[PDB]
Amino acid sequence: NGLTGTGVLTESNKKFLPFQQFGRDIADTTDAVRDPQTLEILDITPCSFG
Amino acid sequence: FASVYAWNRKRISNCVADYSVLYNSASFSTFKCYGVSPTKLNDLCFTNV
Amino acid sequence: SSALGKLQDVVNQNAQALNTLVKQLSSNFGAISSVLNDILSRLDPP
Ligand SMILES: *[C@@H]1O[C@H](CO)[C@@H](O[C@@H]2O[C@H](CO)[C@@H](O)[C@H](O)[C@H]2NC(C)=O)[C@H](O)[C@H]1NC(C)=O
């Protein structure tokens, strides 16, 4: 719903407080989201580069 | 419609708004936006309009 | 077992610089946002 990105999506275990849209990481990169339809938290690991 | 000095103000909520279908209702005389192209608005999402 | 500040100092200076480099990926420098998916998918290439 607006967040555009790339990466691997994985089942989370971080208790997104009932009111937290997403997860913010130090140095400010999106690293978790909540699925709008089912409302579950998913981590967004980065693809492989090098 | 309303007069200008007491201008109307509607607030839209949860809906499916197709902006391209609004774009070609085919009678307008000014359709100008600054923040964003109108055809690209068909794949965003907001909180309040 | 109970002094290695030179080594500590070095090991640190580098981390403080690498963090400042990443923390700059979230400044506008005079733009509408810091995200290209907000400037891109919100405007024309022109
Ligand atoms: C959008 O619709 C889906 C279903 O189409 C909603 O999903 C439900 O979420 C609740 C959680 O409170 C579950 O108990 C239901 O079983 C879900 N339904 C289905 C069919 O999976 C979703 O909540 C809706 N969006 C919002 C914001 O409420």
Curated annotation (Swiss-Prot), chain B:
Domain of life assignment: Viruses
Function: Attaches the virion to the cell membrane by interacting with host receptor, initiating the infection. The major receptor is host ACE2. When S2/S2' has been cleaved, binding to the receptor triggers direct fusion at the cell membrane. When S2/S2' has not been cleaved, binding to the receptor results in internalization of the virus by endocytosis using host TFRC and GRM2 and leading to fusion of the virion membrane with the host endosomal membrane. Alternatively, may use NRP1/NRP2 and integrin as entry receptors.
Subunit structure: Binds to host ACE2. RBD also interacts with the N-linked glycan on 'Asn-90' of ACE2. Cleavage of S generates a polybasic C-terminal sequence on S1 that binds to host Neuropilin-1 (NRP1) and Neuropilin-2 (NRP2) receptors. Interacts with host integrin alpha-5/beta-1 (ITGA5:ITGB1) and with ACE2 in complex with integrin alpha-5/beta-1 (ITGA5:ITGB1). May interact via cytoplasmic c-terminus with M protein. May interact (via N-terminus) with host bilirubin and biliverdin, thereby preventing antibody binding to the SARS-CoV-2 spike NTD via an allosteric mechanism.
The protein, known as: Spike protein S1
